[PDB]
Design a protein around this ligand. Structure first.
Ligand SMILES: Nc1ncnc2c1ncn2[C@@H]1O[C@H](COP(=O)(O)OP(=O)(O)O)[C@@H](O)[C@H]1O
Ligand SMILES: [Co+2]
Ligand SMILES: [Co+2]
Ligand SMILES: [Co+2]
Ligand SMILES: [Co+2]
Ligand SMILES: [Co+2]
Ligand SMILES: [Mg+2]
Ligand SMILES: [Mg+2]
Length: 208
């Protein structure tokens, strides 16, 4: 029960399950939102952003992952809501750009694509702040790169990404005072974990 190659339909499934899992957790993610203003909308913003990506994907499936990523990417970018939706759309724009000429990817390209998304999002945000979705995504990609170096299995890779992304998210209150004073982890980072956990379900052949 090992996934060594991700084609366009497996990536579509990861997108759909990631979106569904975020949707199911959107009210919780909204309730955590305090930075930079406590306006209760991170989960809705990222839910609607990922739904735009998911809708484009569902209507334009492909075996070729690079083509499927262009479709996903365009959907996010034309529906990005709020700080968190804009960052989410830029993380996956860089991820999808990195694979655009590929028909399927392996664990090392997957890890490199998370890293590529981190670089794109950090450059897109004019004044990046730590303790946020950027930090969680950055720590997830660094873990990806380290683990893919000795693992062909994308399921075991994604498991490890989630463990390290989760530790990063639990640390966000130590980087950003408002998170610590209110007593919450970063809502953007939590929304991103929801998507990553859907990715893992799909890699396992399961539904959310
Ligand atoms: N400068 C920044 N750098 C990194 N992340 C940010 C920044 N500003 C906002 N975020 C992310 O966005 C999340 C809030 O998203 P959202 O509620 O959609 O923003 P808003 O409602 O202010 O548009 C934060 O929890 C954090 O993860
Ligand atoms: Co639909
Ligand atoms: Co090639
Ligand atoms: Co092949
Ligand atoms: Co690089
Ligand atoms: Co800059
Ligand atoms: Mg908000
Ligand atoms: Mg808002």
């Amino acid at each position: 029960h090992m996934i060594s190659k991700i084609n366009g339909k497996l990536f579509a499934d990861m997108i759909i399950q990631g979106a569904q899992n975020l949707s199911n957790n959107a009210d919780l993610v909204d309730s955590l939102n305090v930075y930079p203003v406590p306006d209760g909308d991170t989960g809705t913003n990222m839910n609607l952003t990922m739904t735009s990506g998911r809708e484009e994907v569902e209507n334009n499936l492909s075996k070729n992952i690079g083509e499927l990523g262009k479709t996903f990417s365009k959907g996010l970018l034309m529906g990005a809501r709020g700080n968190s939706g804009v960052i989410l759309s830029q993380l996956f724009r860089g991820f999808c750009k990195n694979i655009e000429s590929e028909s399927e990817i392996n664990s090392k390209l997957l890890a490199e694509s998370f890293q590529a998304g981190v670089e794109t999002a950090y450059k897109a945000v004019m004044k990046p702040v730590e303790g946020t979705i950027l930090t969680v995504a950055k720590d997830a990609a660094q873990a990806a790169i380290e683990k893919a170096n000795n693992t062909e299995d994308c399921i075991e890779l994604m498991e490890y990404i989630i463990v390290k992304a989760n530790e990063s998210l639990e640390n966000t209150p130590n980087l950003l005072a408002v998170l610590k004073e209110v007593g919450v982890v970063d809502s953007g980072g939590k929304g991103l974990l929801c998507v990553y956990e859907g990715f893992l379900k799909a890699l396992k052949g399961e539904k959310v």
